[PDB]
Amino acid sequence: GHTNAVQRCSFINKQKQLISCGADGLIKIWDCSSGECLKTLDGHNNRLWALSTMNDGDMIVSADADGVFQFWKDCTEQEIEEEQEKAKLQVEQEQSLQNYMSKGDWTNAFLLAMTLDHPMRLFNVLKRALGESRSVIFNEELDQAISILNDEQLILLMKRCRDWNTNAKTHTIAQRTIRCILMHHNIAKLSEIPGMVKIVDAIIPYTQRHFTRVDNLVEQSYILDYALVEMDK
Amino acid sequence: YNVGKAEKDGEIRLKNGVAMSKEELTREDKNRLRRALKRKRSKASTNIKL
Amino acid sequence: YQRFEQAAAFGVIASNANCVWIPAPGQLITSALEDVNIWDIKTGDLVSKLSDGLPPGASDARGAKPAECTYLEAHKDTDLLAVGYADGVIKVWDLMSKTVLLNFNGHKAAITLLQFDGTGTRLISGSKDSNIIVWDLVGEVGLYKLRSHKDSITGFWCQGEDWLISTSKDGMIKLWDLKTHQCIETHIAHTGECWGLAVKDDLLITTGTDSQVKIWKLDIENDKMGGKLTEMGIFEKQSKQRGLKIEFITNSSDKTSFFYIQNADKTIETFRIRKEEEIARGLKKREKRLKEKGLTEEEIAKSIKESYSSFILHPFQTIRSLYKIKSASWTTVSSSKLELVLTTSSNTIEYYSIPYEKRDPTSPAPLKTHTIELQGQRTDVRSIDISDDNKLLATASNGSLKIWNIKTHKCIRTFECGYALTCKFLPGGLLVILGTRNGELQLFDLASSSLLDTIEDAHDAAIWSLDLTSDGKRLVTGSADKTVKFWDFKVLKLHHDTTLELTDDILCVRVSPDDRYLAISLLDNTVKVFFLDSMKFYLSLYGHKLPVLSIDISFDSKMIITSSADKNIKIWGLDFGDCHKSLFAHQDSIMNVKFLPQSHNFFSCSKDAVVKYWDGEKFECIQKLYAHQSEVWALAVATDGGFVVSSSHDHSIRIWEETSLKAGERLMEALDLGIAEIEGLEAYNRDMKNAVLIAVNKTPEQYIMDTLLRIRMSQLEDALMVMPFSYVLKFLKFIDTVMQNKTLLHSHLPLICKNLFFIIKFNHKELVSQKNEELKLQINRVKTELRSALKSTEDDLGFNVQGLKFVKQQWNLRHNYEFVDEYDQQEKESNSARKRVFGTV
Secondary structure: OOOOOEEEEEEEOOOOEEEEEEOOOOEEEEEOOOOEEEEEEOOOOOOEEEEEEEOOOOEEEEEEOOOOEEEEEOOHHHHHHHHHHHHHHHHHHHHHHHHHHHHOOHHHHHHHHHHHOOHHHHHHHHHHHHHHHHOOOOOHHHHHHHHOOOHHHHHHHHHHHHHHHHOOOOHHHHHHHHHHHHHOOOHHHHHHOOOHHHHHHHHHHHHHHHHHHHHHHHHHOHHHHHHHHHHHO | OOOOOOOOOOEEEOOOOOEEEOOOOOHHHHHHHHHHHHHHHHHOOHHHHO | OOOEEEEEEEOOOOOOOOOEEEOOOOEEEEEEOOEEEEEEOOOOOEEEEEOOOOOOOOOOOOOOOOOOEEEEEEEOOOOEEEEEEOOOEEEEEEOOOOEEEEEEEOOOOOEEEEEEOOOOOEEEEEEOOOOEEEEEOOOOEEEEEEOOOOOOEEEEEOOOOOEEEEEEOOOEEEEEEOOOOEEEEEEEOOOOOOOEEEEEOOEEEEEOOOOEEEEEEEOHHHOOOOOOEEEEEEEEOOOOOOEEEEEEEEOOOOOOEEEEEEEOOOEEEEEEEOOHHHHHHHHHHHHHHHHHHOOOHHHHHHHHHHOHHHHHEEEEEEEEOOOOEEEEEEEEEOOOEEEEEEEEOOOOEEEEEEEEEOOEEOOOOOEEEEEEOOOOOOOOEEEEEEOOOOOEEEEEEEOEEEEEEOOOOOEEEEEOOOEEEEEEEOOOOOEEEEEEOOOOEEEEEOOOOEEEEEEOOOOOOOOOEEEEOOOOOEEEEEOOOOEEEEEEEEOOEEEEEEEEEOOOOEEEEEEOOOOOEEEEEEOOOOEEEEEOOOOOEEEEEOOOOOOEEEEEEOOOOOEEEEEEOOOOEEEEEOOOOEEEEEEOOOOOOEEEEEEOOOOOOEEEEEOOOOEEEEOOOOOOEEEEEOOOOOOOOEEEEOOOOOEEEEEOOOOOEEEEEEOOOOOOHHHHHHHHHHHHHHHHHHHHHHHHOOHHHHHHOOOHHHHHHHHHHHOOHHHHHHHHHHOOHHHHHHHHHHHHHHHHOHHHHHHOHHHHHHHHHHHHHHOHHHHHHOOOHHHHHHHHHHHHHHHHHHHHHHHHHHHHHHHHHHHHHHHHHHHOOOOOOHHHHHHHHHHHOOOOOOOOO
C-alpha cells in the first residue's frame, strides 16, 4: 500500500499491529492478523528515516528529513471514553424527551428537540402546542424559550420553518414560529447571523403565495353573506 | 428553493417538507421508508470427516 | 413402500435450556431437544418424558426440524410448566396430566426467558426478537407488547404488577410502567452487551461482557422523572468471561442473602450480602485504618465511595466443574449449608452442596453430592453399530464407549477408550472392536466388561474406518497412514497378515457381503475396488469432486453407493463401474449411506440434520426424516432391516421403526351518526335546564371530520353533490358544532372552507327559499367565525412577509455594494441574480 519505499517497520500493540514509515512521508498502521491498513497518519512532507516506539507503541515519534518531529500518542480508549459519555447523555435526553411529550410539558420538550436535532418530534411539539394555544403566540413559557435561542439554534429552527412553509398543509405552524422569532428577538441581530438572509430569501416567496390563497378563501366566504341577504328578503 | 435531500446523513427529508432523523424512527418505520426508497429508485482429512 | 417413524429417542439428559428444580435432593426438569425430561436426582433415573406428539416421519408431521426447547419455567403452587421453543411458540403444560393446555404464538424468534407472575394468572415472555409480551393465562390472549428494545431480551424483573425492569443484548436498562405500556427510564448498563439482571429489595446487580459488575439501587417511587435507577458502585468478579445468570436466595432463619454469577467459563462464583450491622462495623473499622494512615477526611469519604462495593458484597466461594456450565439454579438454602444444581454443555447434571459456618465456607471446595451421567455420553457419538441379534447397540464417543438396549433404551456397560472413530460388533455380538484416532485398536468383551486387547501400533495415524468379513475371522482397517492392514482372529488375539499401501489417505473401507469385493475410498476423490481373495485391482471409480466419506455395497454385490462431501450420491454398477445416477441429495456433506438388507433401497444422512429414505431402482427420495437438530454423525441399519438407528451432534440417539360503500354514501352515514348524538346531547342539556364512537374513542365532531379527510379530493366534490338537501342541513350544523372547537377549526381550516362553499354554491337556490329562522342564525354564526379564523391566518402571513422583507432590505444596505453608475449595477445584479436551466424544444 505504500506509494514509495518503506524505510522503517516496528511492532506495536504486542502481536496485533505493525506500523511502517515510507519515503512518501506517510505512516501507516496495519493489522498483522488480517494484513490491512487500519489507519494512516500524515504529519510530514518528506522522507522519514527514523521511527521510535515506547510502551508497545503507545508513544510513537517520527522525524522528517526536513527536521520535523510528530509526537503521536495513543488515544483510542480516550476517544472511546468520550463517546461512551456522549452516548450516555444522548440516551438520557431521548428518554426525557419522550416522557415530556406524553405529559404535555411542551416548553421543555421543545428545548430537548432542538438539542437532539429531532425534526419530527420538534414539529409535533410546535404543532400540538399550537393546538392548545387556539383554545401570546404559543404560550408564555414556550415563547420565553424561543427568545433565549442562540444564533446556531435560530439558524437551525428557521431552516425547519423554511421547509415546512413549502407545504401548504403545514405552513400554519411555520408562520407562527417565525412570528415568535421576530417578536422576541432584536431584528438587527437576526440580519447579521450568516446564512439567515438566504433562508429568509426562500421563505418570502412561499409566504406571499399562502397570502394570495386564504385571501381568496375570504372572498369566497362572502357567498354566505349573499345567502343571508337573499334569505332575509 | 426546492426541498431536496437532507444535508445531514442521518436525517431523511422528503419533498413534502417532512424531515425525520433516523434516531427518531422506529424500526418498522425505518424498514417502510427503505422500501419506499427502493420503489422510487426502481421507477427511475480431519476437517472433512469430523 | 412402507414408512419409517421415530420409535424412541434417548441419550439426551440436558439440552440447550435452563434447568428447573422442583422440591420433592428432589426432582429436576430438563429440556431434551423437543421433549422435556423429568429426572430424579437421588436415583438418576428418568421419571417422565413430555412429548407433544406428531412423531417425526408421520405424514401429518411437519417437513422441518422440530423446534428445540429454549426455556423452562414451572409455577410451583399451580404445577403448570411453561415451555419455550426455538421458533417462538410458548406452550403451557400440565405436569400432572403431562399434556399441553395453552399454545401461544407471539414471538418470531427463540424464547430467551419466561417468568410467571406472583399470582400465576399472567405470564411474561421475552424472546430473541427483542419483544416482551405479557400473556393472560385465564384469557389465553396477549395483553400488550413492549417493543423499546433493539436486541434479544437477556433478562427482566417484574415482581409486582405495576412496574417492570427489562434488560436486552443492546446493553440497556429500561424501566416499564405496566399501566401505561411505556418505557419510563433508559440507562446504558455496559459499554457492550448486558446479560444478567437480579433485583433484591433496592439492590440491583447487572453483568456485562467483562468481569466488571454494576450495582444499582432501585428507588421505585422516586418520581423525579429520573434517578429511579441510580448506579451504586462497581466490583469485579474473578472470571474475565461474561456472566450469563444471577440468582438470589435468602436463608429464612438468619435473613442471610447469597447470589451467584453463572459465568460463560466452567466457573460459578457465589457471593454473600453483608448485613447492615456488618457494613457499619466495617465502615467504622476501615475509617480508623484510613484515619490511622493519615488521609484527609475528604479523601476518606471519597475512598469509602470508591470502596463502596466491598462493604455490601463478600466473595463466598467458587464452584469449578470439569465441563462448561449451561444453566444453574439454587436448590436449598440453610444455615448449615448451601446447595446448587447445574447443567453442563456436555450432557450431565451436577449437584453441588456447600457447607458453611457464619462468614466463610467450612471446606475449601464445594461437595459434589450427585451426578446423572449413566444414560448419556459426554462427547458426540462418531460411530454406531447394531449387534447381529438386533438387541444391543454399540455407540463410540470421544473418551467413552457406551452400549444400550434397543428395547429398554438403557445403557448396560461403559468403557473408557480413546477418540474412537469406528466401532463394530463381532459375530455373536459378544465383543466389540474400535479404531482410535491415536492409531490404536481396542477390543472389548461384554461379558468380561473389560478391554481384552490393545494393539498400540495398529496404524501410524488415525484408523479412519474398519470393516469385517461376512465370515467374521478377518478384519480390514483403513487409516490416514495410507495403508490397509489385514488381521486375523486366532484363539482371542489379532495377528497382522498383509499390508496394502495406497497413494493417498484412506477415508473408508467396505467389504462386500459376498466377501469378493473390497471397496476403499481415498483422499484423491477416487474409490478403489479390489478382489478380496487375490487383492487384484479391479476398478477405479472417478468423478467425485470432494472425498468419498461412506461406501456401501448392495446385498447382491451389484450396486455400490458412494457418498461424498460434495453433496452428491453416486450409484455404480460393480459389473463395469458405470455410474447409474448421481443424486443431489442433501444441502451439505453426506456422511453415511447404508443399504437396507435384501433390497436396493438405501438411507442417507448429512450435516444438514436430515435423514432421507431413497429408492434404489427408481432413484427417488421416498421420505424425508426431520428429527435431529445438527450434524448426524453416524447411522446404522438392522440385519433384518426392521429399524434404523441415527446419532447426531445433539447427543440424541433416535430409532426409526418400520410401520362496499362509496364516497358520499360514507359521508351520509357519518353525518347521521354524529349529528344524532349532537342532537341528543343538546336535547338532553335543554331538558335538564353510541357504541361505535365509544369503540373508536372519538368525539362526534372528529368522527365526521375524520370521514371527510379520508375522502379523496378528486372524489370529494362528486361525493358532496350526491347528498340530498336534508343532509346539507345536517352538514351545516356539523360545521356549526365544529366552530366551538377552535382546535379542530384551525387544524382543518382549508378543508372546511372548500367543502362549505361548494355545498352552498351547488344548492344555493334551494337554501335561500327556506324560511327557517334557526338556519339563519346558524349561518350567521358560521359566517363570523370563518372570517375571524381566516383573518387570523391571513394576519400572520401579512405580518411575517412584511417583517422578512425588512430583514432583507436592512442587510442589503449594510453588506451590499452599490455602484453609483447605473450601467455597472445592472451587470452586478445580473450575475448575482439566481440562474436556473430549463428545457426548450
